[PDB]
Amino acid sequence: TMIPLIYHPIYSQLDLPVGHRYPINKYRLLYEEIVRQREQSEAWQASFEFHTPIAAELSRITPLHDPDYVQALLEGRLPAAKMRRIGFPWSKTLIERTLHSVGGTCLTVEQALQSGVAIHLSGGYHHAHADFGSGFCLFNDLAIAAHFALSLPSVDKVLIIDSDVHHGDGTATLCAERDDIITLSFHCDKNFPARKPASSMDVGFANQTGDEEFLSTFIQVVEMAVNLHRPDLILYDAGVDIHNDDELGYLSISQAAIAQRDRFMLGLAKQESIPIACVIGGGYREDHAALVPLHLELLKAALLSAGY
Ligand SMILES: O=C(CCCCCCC(=O)Nc1ccccc1)NO
Ligand SMILES: [K+]
Ligand SMILES: [K+]
Ligand SMILES: [K+]
Ligand SMILES: [K+]
Ligand SMILES: [Zn+2]
């Protein structure tokens, strides 16, 4: 009944202009909120433990990403226009953060294999492709972690379930020609990115889709994809940019429905005895801390699911 949480203090240590769209403080604030829950509550103290990652090895990245793309980012030589498409100014701290977060999704996988359920307090970089970055993504932690997971003995088949409001295009292109990683994306069709190469299965929702349509579809599609593919491991992107107050997403999902989504996902994995490694994914609010209660729903779901 232990739930590993994966966190590194470098996650919010990036220097960004104010006004920058990326809610860089949410990671440390979410971590601090959980630290406070643990002081307040015997249940949170007893049910969760933290695991700090070290940077991912470069050999774990280059099976998915082009080496010259990797090298250009390592050396801060990525052409200016390509770096802007990523959406961050280059710095060594950005590279160190990224590699640590990739390491973290990989650790979440090992931890999920051991305990059943593990949550990464970062991650979900589904817009990175083999040879370019976009949409705040440099390297694709989900695909990287799925490829790594397949190196392990118990795992032959990985299902990535992406509930972030944006299409997992990078993940789609990275896994399109491999039958050992299956990609499922739910998303708002009119949100970024414009071009949506096929996942294994895609569910695109109209603007202002609300709780019942989203949840009924999520429940049935996920249950089907789990039955169809019988994965050894699920990677679950629990992005909260589906939320009705998100500043980028165009869906109308409530915090209550986010909770029900996470409860359902985690409860299915448990019922089926499939290890599930979770990434908190995206979320956009100029009030970065406003994302904290939305992401915390994943933890409340895991807490309830584990039996407290
Ligand atoms: O959370 C997300 C990130 C979505 C990426 C942001 C969408 C819009 C965007 O990146 N536009 C853009 C980028 C560079 C320059 C101008 C616009 N996906 O999971
Ligand atoms: K294997
Ligand atoms: K998605
Ligand atoms: K595939
Ligand atoms: K919205
Ligand atoms: Zn998103």
Numbering used by the authors: 11 to 318
Paper excerpt:
Classical Zn2+-dependent deac(et)ylases play fundamental regulatory roles in life and are well characterized in eukaryotes regarding their structures, substrates and physiological roles. Structurally, these enzymes are composed of a central eight-stranded parallel β-sheet flanked by α-helices on each site, known as the α/β-arginase/deacetylase fold. All active site residues were conserved, as shown by the multiple sequence alignment and the structural alignment, suggesting a general acid/base catalytic mechanism for the bacterial enzymes as described for the eukaryotic counterparts.
As described for mammalian Zn2+-dependent HDACs, the hydroxamates coordinated the catalytic Zn2+-ion in a bidentate fashion, the carbonyl oxygen replacing the carbonyl oxygen of the acetamide in the substrate and the hydroxyl group replacing the position of the catalytic water molecule. For all structures, we confirmed the binding of the inhibitors within the substrate binding tunnel with the catalytically important Y of the XGGY-motif forming a hydrogen bond to the carbonyl oxygen of the hydroxamate group. For cluster 5, the enzyme of Vibrio cholerae HdaH of sub-cluster 5b, VcHdaH (5b), was a monomer in solution, as confirmed by the crystal structure and by analytical size-exclusion chromatography. We identified VcHdaH (5b) being an active de-decanoylase. We were not able to perform inhibitor studies with VcHdaH (5b) because the observed de-decanoylase activity was neither strong enough to perform Michaelis–Menten kinetics nor to determine Ki/IC50 values. Whether VcHdaH (5b) is inhibited by the HDAC11-selective trapoxin A analog TD034173 or recently reported HsHDAC11-selective hydroxamates needs further investigation.
